[PDB]
Write a protein that binds this ligand. Structure first.
Ligand SMILES: [Cl-]
Ligand SMILES: [Cl-]
Ligand SMILES: [Cl-]
Ligand SMILES: [Cl-]
Lengths: 385, 385, 385, 385
């Protein structure tokens, strides 16, 4: 059945899950406390193709279906949000943009390593002054003999550090209309330079501790002519496509986190007793479980659908935005109800439910805030009829 | 393509919807205020075999999948909630119960007429004293020479006054334990008796006005031996199975109504302007549209999944409950938002959104209230911990 | 205590409530179905001075505080939403506007009749082409010799067909910029004219059936020079003030309806039995009752506060908007839950909960939609800081 | 006006707020990271009579009204949630219980030090096994020669490790029916003992880092005859009253935290812009601001109401529970929306909104979970009429 794991998926997810429980799960709590970038697990995960999941085998990638890649992200997120974000962003953003707008030359130069894991990718779109209106990037890319002169600063760029390959957006030409500033922007891919690129101090986050998020400062950074990704002044349109893909991944990440929280509360409730009976026998508890279960089930069907469309070469901007919005909002709520079901213990770090919420909370913000996705969704509904 | 309409589905739905737009849509508003049972449309719908949708062609049915049946219910609901309910209940309860537990002789005796729509089916389970706790039925059936004697009252029976075939659940033997009243109940299928069955006045309802609803008073009704449907005292297990199938139909009915409300508000939002601009541009309206569209898509995926599981012969109690719960809640909220988007006009009957809400409101109550469904969902979740 | 009914309030409300239970309550169900305007009740209510609640006794009014008037509206709404709306609108809009901006000559000419209930007042602001954007009126007032000429259409006017006194807002002077349209609007108060005013047919509404609502068509209507209410072109500033007073009344109306719904559901749950126990013992029901009671208590405190501010001649735009927004949303939700608690019975008109919801649904739309109020609130909040 | 700060209240709050801004606010973020108990602030706060707020001047207290104390708790929670919990618990629980059930000897013995802050109080009710169903305590008190011997474990006890005075609930007599264990419990008040009391082992919390929270291990702890607080075996009844008072404190704590988050998002929104315009100009943002403001105003009115009923010596179990439930749920919601409004910066610890949520999250659990409170409210509503 379509909504279930096919025999081909059950053969890739089966062994991937064992690995997750044995090498990722045990150190999840500690990593949330330490915040130490898990280089080991990254190289260890790359083995399953995880870091080149969507890259064609020809380029070294594992050439998997966007559908399969999503289920793996869910699986990773079920045990470690931080890792899930690293994996999802690396593939969806940095790698995805290169594979999407890269020439055969650019692809050959980056994809093999990215898909390998020996080089992590950073996607610089978000800046300090434009957390939502992306097209309003102030980072510049002035034409210079030999290449370009990138001048600007990126903010909250996943893999800001630890990044071997970078993809940065920058305006190279006028909008011209202040409105449509989406035109005039260009994308530039390149390897970690040795001058002109400063990596700000590590940002302390509410959760996803171990994930790498840094500020990027570009002081007169030169990039070869071979850096421009896509058509000059048309990179933002490739950006939107990349995000659509990214959103599918984030949705799966959300579901993973929400499912973990739910499974935990389910088990807890069945055991924990109050007033002479399992707290689960109380509707106040059962209703929360039922609601969460139902919504996460719907969240999953939504990203599976979005992934199915993407693989079919059909439009999915609306469907990816719908999946991300729903999974994110539903997961965070399920996580919050888990905290409530655990009661006083839900408030203590000894248990995972508080981390689940902290990790999942970012899914309603990253790669398009829920508010942003609703406008995206509404615009599509309206332009349709 | 799983989530989209297939070639065989489209072959049926394409012409079916054309018929709905031309023959059903014109008079839905009028039927809502007069409550006049559309015998005309019943016969016309019956030409598409929709009154015996899940019945095998061998028995005069259309032999459709539960997936296609559900999509057709959704299509009808989009234009007329009362008709959708008429179709969904006739098929799922009375007809479905006979198809499920009926011997080959009973199926040959009842299905042909039920399937052709020549005789509508009424399913009498609910009583003035028990709805959610159906197992607490008070109606009784005494084994008499030549058959049985029925005595009791049924409440809120769809098609109660217009049906040619009746399926009634009644107590035949003690629990014997008060904790398990479910055991000891039996079902009886019989044609409209000339004596012994008194129909109460058509009750005034909040919505679904043209849907036939009535109280049934059984006074020493005599039914022959061939009336016993399923094992004596085992009727409740068939009831539960019938309800699982019925909930899929109700979920699709809700999606239909919610989709209609949303599409209406969209059209309105795109045209009606306030403060010098289409009200749709205001995030207050856009957010409502986005949220509703997103939940309805999820709702449809949920019932499709449940239908798929039922057709595969696999368990779907949990999945049918989840579909019905989510669909009804989502649909009702979308209808309430449509009323809000239309503002003052949403409060007047010259427009359909106030009717969409009144019609859909029943979906959160019939065939298992949302509260009942959450318990069903929670219990299933707890048994597979 | 402040939040409780004081000595003078109780001396008024004690006998008022006894009157409502015996004279208003018996026929509320019938009025909802027939829509017949209750002239007998209007007259009886008027003997309590309720039709001139806030009008100074010097002008034939009752001279009550806004706090007491609000409690009275709540009391009426508990038994008949239609009547509560009639009382609230008559007092807050037409009467309130004349009381607020009228010269002593106009007050003496109109208030005595309005305050005794001899003449009901209609306030025409909303139009077919504009509701929330009231300043975008199309109705026009032409300065003529001896008075003015009115031409335009008014939509959904309370008491529009039964009013003996009208207050109509019409454009008299062109606004400067296409933004500050709120300037250049004027108000006119006059008795029902023999010619010039055509009342459209009573509109069919979702609820508040017996409430008089009509469209007004003004064709070359001549009003004497004394009809001008307030400074020419400055009428919209009085409108905004009048609306602030109106929202307090509507908030109280909502509390009344929601409280009636909750009280009924409470009574039912205590008596209705399921699974061997009163439905109230199930947290699925108890939670609904608790949340509703809590929000209604909060809603009441909110309108009481705004009324106190108004009585103190203190600014209350923000506070009245908060009360109306919270009360309407809370009351509507409590009514929806009361329907759910009654299950199948909640869907039939033999019981009042379906009427409570239909009646209360208007409170989230009239006098400014919840969306409009949130903007009003957001803006006030942003100014102070 | 009632709902506003009166002359006597403003005399205290004006200087108190100046103190909070200057002394408490600057170190809040750091304390959330270190968890270091702020002894200097405790001492400075005590100078305001804050640690003996409800204690009569006769016993060395400040002798303030419950509403003034509540407003002071809200004011503190506005800048430091941990400190608010410290003040609220010390006053409401340990001190409140002694003031309530203590004899003149006991009050004279404990209140002076508690009220001056020279001795902080710990209240031991909750245990690793019984939280919600508190009457199911396992700690035991055995009557010995000239006193009692206590044995048990208390968990999540505020001020548990820094307290100078302890109040512990322990069963001294068997209950007649397990369904009513509320009978047979006793309370014991004593100073920090030399032996018999072992401090738990600091468990890390989601928020309120610097608030002292610890497990208490009682090993054959001896307490004199004069340790028994209240009547033997009737302690739980005083416990229920203590909680009613405590809930008012917690409600105010929630409001303070929510207001802080709202004000922050309010200030941010006004400056920060998106798409070439302040994000507050977007209804997505403005709607959030309006909803939270309205609910917080409602929450504040509810706790002021409960506070006055208690001060008036009237019933307030229902009202304190309503206030605590509403405020806690509303505050946590406002804090989550604040995080959302800040977007990416809402997820970084450099800004306070994430801490506001973490601190506020406990108010929905402590001193009776929202679920427990709803049952309390429902029981009262039902026992009513
Ligand atoms: Cl399709
Ligand atoms: Cl009162
Ligand atoms: Cl104040
Ligand atoms: Cl005081």
């Amino acid at each position: 059945l379509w909504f279930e794991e096919g025999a081909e998926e059950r053969q890739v997810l089966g062994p991937f899950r064992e690995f997750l429980k044995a090498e990722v799960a045990p150190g999840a709590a500690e990593r949330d406390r330490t915040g130490a970038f898990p280089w080991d697990l990254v190289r260890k995960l790359a083995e399953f193709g995880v870091f080149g999941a969507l890259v064609p085998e020809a380029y070294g990638g594992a050439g998997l279906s966007t559908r399969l890649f999503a289920r793996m992200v869910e699986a990773i997120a079920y045990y470690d949000g931080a890792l899930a974000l690293t994996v999802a962003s690396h593939n969806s953003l940095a790698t995805g943009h290169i594979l999407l707008a890269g020439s055969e030359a650019q692809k050959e130069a980056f994809l093999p390593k990215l898909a390998s894991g020996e080089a992590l990718g950073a996607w610089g779109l978000t800046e300090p002054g434009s957390g939502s209106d992306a097209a309003a990037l102030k980072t510049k890319a002035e034409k210079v003999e030999g290449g370009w002169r990138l001048n600007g600063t990126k903010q909250f760029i996943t893999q800001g550090s630890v990044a071997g390959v970078y993809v940065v957006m920058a305006r190279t030409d006028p909008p011209p209309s202040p409105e449509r500033k989406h035109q005039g922007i260009s994308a530039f891919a390149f390897f970690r330079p040795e001058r002109g690129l400063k990596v700000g101090r590590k940002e302390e986050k509410l959760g996803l501790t171990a994930s790498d998020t840094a500020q990027l400062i570009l002081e007169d950074l030169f990039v070869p002519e071979e850096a421009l990704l896509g058509e000059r002044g048309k990179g933002f349109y490739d950006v939107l496509r990349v995000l659509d893909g990214g959103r599918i991944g984030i949705a799966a990440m959300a579901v993973g986190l929400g499912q973990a929280a739910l499974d935990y509360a389910l088990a807890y409730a069945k055991g924990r007793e109050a007033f002479g009976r399992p707290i689960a026998e109380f509707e106040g508890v059962s209703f929360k479980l039922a609601e969460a279960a139902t919504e996460l089930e719907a969240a999953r069907l939504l990203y599976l659908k979005a992934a199915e469309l993407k693989d079919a070469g059909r439009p999915f901007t609306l469907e990816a935005a719908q999946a991300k919005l729903f999974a994110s909002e539903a997961a965070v709520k399920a996580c919050d109800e888990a905290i409530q079901i655990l009661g006083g213990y839900g408030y203590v770090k000894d248990y995972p439910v508080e981390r689940y919420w902290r990790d999942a909370r970012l899914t309603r913000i990253g790669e398009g805030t829920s508010e942003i996705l609703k406008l995206v969704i509404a615009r599509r509904l309206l332009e349709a009829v």
